[PDB]
Amino acid sequence: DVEFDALLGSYCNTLSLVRFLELGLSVACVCTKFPELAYMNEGRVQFEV
Amino acid sequence: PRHHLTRQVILTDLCQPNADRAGTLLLALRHPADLPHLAHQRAPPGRQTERLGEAWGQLMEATALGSGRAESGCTRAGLVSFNFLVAACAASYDARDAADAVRAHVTANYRGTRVGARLDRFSECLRAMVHTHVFPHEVMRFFGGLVSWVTQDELASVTAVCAGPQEAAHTGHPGRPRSAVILPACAFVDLDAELGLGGPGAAFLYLVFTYRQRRDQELCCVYVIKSQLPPRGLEPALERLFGRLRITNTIHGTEDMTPPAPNRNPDFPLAGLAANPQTPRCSAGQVTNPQFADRLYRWQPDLRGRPTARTCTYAAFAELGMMPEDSPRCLHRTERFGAVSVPVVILEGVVWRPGEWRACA
Amino acid sequence: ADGFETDIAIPSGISRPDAAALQRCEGRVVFLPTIRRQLTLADVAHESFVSGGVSPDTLGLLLAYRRRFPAVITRVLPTRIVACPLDVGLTHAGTVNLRNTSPVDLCNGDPISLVPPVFEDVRLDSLDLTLRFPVPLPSPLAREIVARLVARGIRDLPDLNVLYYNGSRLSLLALGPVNAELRSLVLNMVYSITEGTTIILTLIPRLFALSAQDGYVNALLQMQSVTREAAQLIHPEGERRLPLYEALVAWLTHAGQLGDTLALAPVVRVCTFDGAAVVRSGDMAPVIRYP
Amino acid sequence: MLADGFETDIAIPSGISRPDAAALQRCEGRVVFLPTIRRQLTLADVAHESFVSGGVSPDTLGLLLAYRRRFPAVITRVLPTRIVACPLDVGLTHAGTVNLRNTSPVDLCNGDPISLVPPVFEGQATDVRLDSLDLTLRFPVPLPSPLAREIVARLVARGIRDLNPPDLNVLYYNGSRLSLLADVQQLGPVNAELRSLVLNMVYSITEGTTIILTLIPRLFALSAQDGYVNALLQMQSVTREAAQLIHPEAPALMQDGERRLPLYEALVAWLTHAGQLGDTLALAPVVRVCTFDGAAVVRSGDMAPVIRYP
């Protein structure tokens, strides 16, 4: 008697990294990065109408 | 050093980590579905049966009138903040000026409406804890001190330190790192003064509830006691402070409970019948047969009027933690809590080790 | 990096279904005689707990667990079972997954003692041994449940099968074997309690005598104070002797023996982190011992 | 517990007779009571001289009430300048192992909880005097947990004899015979041990214990049919001649017994007082032995590893 099994191939996934600039939902955004934020307390923005 | 964090998303019904900022005590609960029939099971006879759940019902009905936080959900409140429990029992402290000062920001700095309705009701629940005889130290249990808190509407995320130093946990703000213990001055009571024992050394922090059992108003007092005694040596010290409370809980508290018809009985003749050899005996095979048990002595004890140790209960304790320095550091400052100033004891370098509870009855 | 792990080796000859049950066997409380880097598997098995003569009942495990040293199984290799002892190796690291064999779902911040499976079984034929895993239920329930199950057998000489925990019913009944298996725990209660309540009765004959309320509380408070009136209000003082003081020592040995067994010390506490608040049946709970 | 552990420096005064210096190096593992957790202390606070009461030298039975107000610590290493010790209530070391050199007539086995007992034994007392510094050191005897519960039970029952105007002295362990001393016991500390009993005695009596008193005539008949039940009565119990005379019967009906459990209230209150009493009289068994290399018996006069308990 001769009997055997075999592993015919093995398949993976490719998780494409999604840059947020590749999204054009950034056109609803003004993204600027702080070097640090958690040091900062309440900041604010002035407007003149 | 090694310290252990905890995370448990609990409601903000009776806790405000937005208010009680950093390094306050927290207390876990037993999810009160267990409560109502335990009072129906473990109460002394003759007392009121369902007073606990009816009083606890009036709390849960008055937790949220607006927006309809329902009376039952999957997520149930488990945590009670320490400054809430002090303000609950606030009518019974010795220093009335600081007592209302704790209650002042509780009614104001919390997030909600009609907070004073909760306070007079939760204390009424605590008055119903003792009479219906489910003791709060069976229900309350230590939970760690705050380091960070993620809040929203009603539910919030809580990060607490279960064991190790209160300091060494990172806050989450590198602008304001490591925190210290904040306690109201109404509860922090040393025994270095009231035993007169100075000198350097380490001290063992202790949580202490107080129970005044009576058919009238019953009380609660919570104390964080700094002492150099072990749990093997704390028992006379809690007796010497609260000795009159020990006497009244023996005398009162057993009403109504029916005595037997006096008197039962004249005392047992075991010492009298053992000396005389003429007294009738019986073998092992002769007993539990009726004829040999006819000539034997009949002895009916009655214990219905006995004030026993379950109803002689006064104050109880558990281990809280150490202060490993040569001399402990206790500062007395006042902070806002804008714009209410509260007398606050600040403790330094607390290392947490919980322990099992112990009744001093 | 100064890690410490025990290695329990399996003797060879394992059947393919017995290796899968031990693959399923996961992080649970497992006892061992002495802390050692290597160990034989026959110490782990239930046959190692025998006193005679007699395969041990519910009582004898409670005697044994104070002498044994509890460990929790880590990963299970086919050649070795790796476990870390709780009382020494855990304290430097603090890192254990523990799985409920319990019917009771666990809350956060509970202390955890452990009971033999009296509430109610991994068995191996090719190794010719059994494995009993204890039940890690919380310690306030543990003083309750043992007192419930003893009080069941007292009635054999109001329903005791009811327990609620955090909104969950329990049924302690599930009758035949358990009532007979627990019988030794019942007898050592009734011997210790009734012998006490005669000797205390013998020294003070007015306890169950006068009065029902008044003279009893009158005799209570004067006895209860710290004052130096102690022996003046207690003691009574051919004709043969009642060996009272020879029975005081022997009763304090037996009642003191039940102290270490029936305390059910809090070996384990749970600190839920990056997970659910309530740990349910069949979940891996995070475990931290007192530092 | 601290991360690096906590150690206390007991300072030695520089006035030293050199044979007493070499005598303190034999102290390598003993037990020392510290009153506080001050990191620096003196030998005067350690020795028996400051350990006396006001005007009264303490006796052997009343010495236990001085122990539970102090902190038993274990010497680790003795330098010529000072003595380094580790408290047991504080987290004991860095690693978790303290070596205890034994002063015991009793051999030790694995997983035995250790309470610690004064020198009681006749002829085997162990003290170290310092004639240069006028210091007398009493180092207590480490013992396993049942023998510590026995010797406390023997001595307390001895004092309750002398309050009323034979015999019980000798106890056995592993078949061997050993005796202990009876000089005097101060009438004050006997009263405090007496009161600590009878409070916890009476607190174990509840309404459900009325029922269990009526199960007494069942056991004396059941002990004839089973050999295991007969070995519990031990031929000397009070219940045997009480079962031959008193036939009790249960009070009925109970007040509010529809809702409640009398036997269950009895058992829970019994465990909290009577079963707790081994902790009440003597001090707590904080220490048990866990040998890291497999060995059954640690011989008398040899070191043993120590891991905390419970």
TrEMBL record, chain A:
- Give the protein name, as stated in the record: Major capsid protein
The gene name on file is UL19
Organism for this UniProt entry: Human herpesvirus 1 (HHV-1)
Automatic annotation (TrEMBL), chain B:
GO cellular component assignments? viral capsid
Q: Kindly indicate whether the keyword tRNA-binding belongs to this entry.
A: no
Q: Please give the superkingdom of this protein's source.
A: Viruses
* Keywords of the record: Capsid protein, Host nucleus, Virion
Q: Which positions form S-S bridges?
A: 89-220
Which GO molecular function annotations are given, in alphabetical order? DNA binding
Protein's GO biological process? viral capsid assembly
What is the name of the protein in this document?
Capsid protein
Q: Please give the organism.
A: Human herpesvirus 1 (HHV-1)
What's the encoding gene here? Answer: UL38
> Which part of the entire protein is covered?
105 to 465 of 465
UniProtKB/TrEMBL annotation, chain D:
Q: Name one Pfam family in it.
A: Herpes_V23
Task: Name the UniProt key words of this record, in alphabetical order.
Answer: Capsid protein, Host nucleus, Virion
Q: Which InterPro entries match?
A: Herpes_capsid_2
Q: Name one GO molecular function term.
A: structural molecule activity
Domain of life of the organism in this record? Answer: Viruses
Q: Name one GO cellular component term.
A: viral capsid
Know the name of this protein?
A: Capsid triplex subunit 2
Q: Which organism is it from?
A: Human herpesvirus 1 (HHV-1)
